[PDB]
Design an enzyme around this catalytic site. Structure first.
Site, short mmCIF file in Angstrom:
data_model
loop_
_atom_site.label_atom_id
_atom_site.label_comp_id
_atom_site.label_asym_id
_atom_site.label_seq_id
_atom_site.Cartn_x
_atom_site.Cartn_y
_atom_site.Cartn_z
N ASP A 132 0.37 -1.78 0.01
CA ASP A 132 -0.10 -0.31 -0.37
C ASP A 132 0.91 0.99 0.06
OD1 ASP A 132 -2.67 1.23 -0.26
OD2 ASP A 132 -2.77 1.96 2.10
N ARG A 136 -0.47 9.12 0.21
CA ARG A 136 -2.37 8.82 1.15
C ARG A 136 -1.50 8.63 2.84
NH1 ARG A 136 -3.66 5.96 -2.52
NH2 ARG A 136 -3.59 3.32 -1.53
N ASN A 137 0.02 7.57 2.22
CA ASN A 137 0.24 6.90 3.67
C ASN A 137 1.83 7.21 4.18
OD1 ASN A 137 -2.21 5.35 3.83
ND2 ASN A 137 -1.29 3.84 2.06
N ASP A 150 0.99 4.89 9.86
CA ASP A 150 1.46 3.22 10.21
C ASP A 150 0.36 2.63 9.39
OD1 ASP A 150 -0.06 2.05 13.06
OD2 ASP A 150 -1.86 2.46 11.75
#
Ligand code: BIJ
Length: 256
Positions: A132, A136-137, A150
């Site tokens: 992922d 955005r992360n 996280d």
């Protein structure tokens, strides 16, 4: 990793994950003190089923120790259940890049790519597949420091063809995703394939089409991105190779 609740002063709500709101706060241990922290909260941990999967995400983070991955500080396992994380004061990368588009130098953008590649080379060395990787992360700790967020907190437009087609996930599929993340960074937080339907992505990839060179992106860096997007996973660089090449691109930029 258990923390007494009274050592946490809950502050302003900053964001929100799946299980619930995320707050900023202060952690008072006899070792700092007054440590700024992020506090992940969980909706309905009155339900014991959601608490077990909520707290499993903390265990996930416990196994990692890297300067560019957010650190688990501890947990409060009685209701309301809280996970205490390192605070990245400047927040989400996408928002940061969008608001600071005409203030951030290219050197900074390349720095963020390089720092992320160090975290990902570390994960690859641990044989951990992330699945992922996307802007955005990513969180912003300082104007000169980003961190993978996280791992608890389908992304077709980021995914490698073998992931889309056959649900194969390897460090090489992560490399493809990182290529997309690099593109996002150099685009100042624009999402890939805007206005394209998810179902149409694999057709474009198989046609040989790729995300275009971002405005003002060094061609050496765009070249690196396109190497991440080799159709054949075995042809993509490993993260350690990306790290090495990003170092040189960064050093060249710092120079002009
Ligand atoms: C003040 O520090 C902030 C502030 C924000 N925001 C400030 C207010 N905005 C309106 C919304 C977002 C968002 C994040 C943030 N800092 C952290 N620091 C650590 C952690 Cl773990 C964290 N958590 C997230 C908070 C929000 C989104 C995500 C997070 C995440 O880890 N991922 C992968 C996505 N956020």
């Amino acid at each position: 990793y258990e923390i007494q609740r009274e050592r946490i002063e809950l502050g302003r709500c900053i964001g929100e994950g799946q299980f619930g709101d995320v707050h900023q706060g202060i952690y008072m241990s006899p070792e700092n003190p007054a440590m700024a922290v992020a506090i992940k909260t969980c909706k309905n941990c009155t339900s014991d089923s959601v608490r077990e999967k909520f707290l499993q995400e903390a265990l996930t983070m416990r196994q990692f120790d890297h300067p560019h991955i957010v650190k688990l500080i501890g947990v409060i396992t009685e209701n309301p259940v809280w996970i205490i994380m390192e605070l990245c004061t400047l927040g989400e990368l996408r928002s940061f890049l969008q608001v600071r588009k005409f203030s951030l130098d290219l050197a900074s953008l390349i720095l963020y790519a390089y720092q992320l590649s160090t975290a990902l080379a570390y994960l690859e060395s641990k044989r951990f597949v992330h699945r992922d990787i996307a802007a955005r992360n990513v969180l912003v700790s300082a104007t000169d420091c980003v961190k993978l967020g996280d791992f608890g907190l389908l992304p077709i437009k980021w995914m490698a063809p073998e992931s889309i087609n056959f649900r194969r996930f390897t460090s090489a599929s992560d490399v493809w995703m990182f290529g997309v993340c690099m593109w996002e960074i150099l685009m100042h937080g624009v999402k890939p394939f805007q206005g394209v339907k998810n179902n149409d992505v694999i057709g474009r990839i198989e046609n040989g089409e790729r995300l275009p060179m971002p405005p003002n992106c060094p061609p050496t860096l765009y070249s690196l991105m396109t190497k991440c997007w080799a159709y054949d996973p075995s042809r993509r660089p490993r993260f350690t190779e990306l790290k090495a090449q990003l170092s040189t691109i960064l050093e060249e930029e710092k120079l002009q």
